[PDB]
Every structure is written in structure tokens, then in C-alpha cells.
């Protein structure tokens, strides 16, 4: 079963790259979303524990 | 010369030669538990930066193109 998707994914991007170049996009979409969404926690994070040290540090 | 003597003698008795010593013993515990506190904070951050920076290098270095 697995060939034979093999076979029709060969067969559909000798027969329309178009849809293969939409995939891309999406995936590519997709993983800039997920990058930003990384980026934005990370951010949350370090401002918070910023926030902390400052907090902490008033000996 | 009351007032004299008692100025001596609090001036003798305040750093001069007071047996008491446990001031150096108390600032030592204060200043022990705020190093322990400050190792401990910085330890935490650095348990979340790891954590966050595995989870950034999952996503970096498995994405190209």
C-alpha cells in the first residue's frame, strides 16, 4: 500500500506540480507560524523571569 | 565629667573590646541565605533557558529550505 502512494505521488508531480508547490507553501506557512508562536513563549518567558531576578535581587 | 565617662565608656564598650562577636555570626547567615537564595534563582533560570533552548533547537536546526 505504501508503494502504491509512492506510485500515485510520482504519477501527480509529473502530472501537476502545482499542487506539490501548494503543499510547500503551506508547510512553509505553517512552520513560520509555529516559529512565531516558539519566539512569542520564549519571549513571555524571559519577561517574566526578568521581571523575577528584578524582584529578587532587592537584597 | 559624667557625661565624659559615660561617653568613654560607650566609646570603650560599642567596637573597642565587646566580647560580644555573634554580630559577625548573624551578618554571615544573612549574607549565606541571600547568596543561597540568588544560586538558587540563577539555577531555576537556567533550568528554563535549557529547556526553552532545546525546544528552540528542535525547531531550528530540524527546518531549512
Known amino acids: ?59 | 565629667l559624667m557625661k565624659l565617662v559615660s561617653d568613654l565608656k560607650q566609646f570603650l564598650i560599642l567596637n573597642d573590646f565587646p566580647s560580644v562577636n555573634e554580630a559577625i555570626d548573624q551578618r554571615n547567615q544573612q549574607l549565606r541565605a541571600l547568596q543561597e537564595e540568588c544560586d538558587r534563582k540563577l539555577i531555576t533560570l537556567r533550568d528554563e533557558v535549557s529547556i526553552d533552548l532545546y525546544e528552540l533547537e528542535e525547531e531550528y536546526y530540524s527546518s531549512s529550505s
Not at chain 1, 7 to 25: A, C, T, W, Y
Open chain 1, 1 to 59: 500500500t505504501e508503494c502504491f502512494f509512492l506510485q500515485k505521488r510520482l504519477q501527480l508531480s509529473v502530472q501537476k506540480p502545482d499542487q506539490v508547490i501548494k503543499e510547500d507553501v503551506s508547510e512553509l506557512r505553517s512552520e513560520l507560524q509555529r516559529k512565531d508562536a516558539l519566539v512569542q513563549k520564549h519571549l513571555t518567558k524571559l519577561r517574566h523571569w526578568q521581571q523575577v531576578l528584578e524582584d529578587i535581587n532587592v537584597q
